[PDB]
Design a binder for this molecule. Structure first.
Ligand SMILES: CNc1ccccc1
Length: 162
């Protein structure tokens, strides 16, 4: 198990444009295309990302390419965020994957509002952090996925993904 396998489980793989849990046009392995309610706008974003006229359909290779870029961009974003970087750096590799998972799902900004969880995670108060993390819109809207990510934060193991 690793960050790529973890997010592949949580996000799935779909080669046609679909709506994510929030109703936003998405493709591949959780690659958000747009928050716009326009399908044509999403197809435009897809063509831009892939570099060809896709007509709402991509290959597995293309999906995995976007997935690579998205994971890489999530990590690089964390490291350029003044609030997230110190907490991330303080974590072990397993919990770092849980950190990337969150940023991948809700964006950098969404996570930065977990100020109290971030502090508990840096202090390594794992049970407390796990309790605080679940007191969120994130947990309430996606409980099963959030439980897995929180368990990873709590334990520093891959038990929730086995
Ligand atoms: C709580 N998730 C998270 C995300 C990014 C860096 C540290 C922690």
């Amino acid at each position: 198990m690793n960050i790529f396998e973890m997010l592949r489980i949580d996000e799935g793989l779909r080669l046609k444009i679909y709506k994510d849990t929030e109703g936003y046009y998405t493709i591949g392995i959780g690659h958000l295309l747009t928050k716009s309610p326009s399908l044509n706008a999403a197809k435009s974003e897809l063509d831009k990302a892939i570099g060809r006229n896709t007509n709402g359909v991509i290959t597995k290779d293309e999906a995995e390419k976007l997935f690579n870029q998205d994971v890489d961009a999530a990590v690089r974003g964390i490291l350029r965020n003044a609030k997230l970087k110190p907490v991330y750096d303080s974590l072990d590799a397993v919990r770092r994957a849980a950190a990337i998972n969150m940023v991948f799902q809700m964006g950098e900004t969404g996570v930065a509002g977990f100020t109290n969880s971030l502090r508990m995670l840096q202090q390594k108060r794992w049970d407390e952090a796990a309790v605080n993390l679940a007191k969120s819109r994130w947990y309430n809207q996606t409980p099963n996925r959030a439980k897995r990510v929180i368990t990873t934060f709590r334990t520093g193991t891959w038990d929730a993904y086995k």
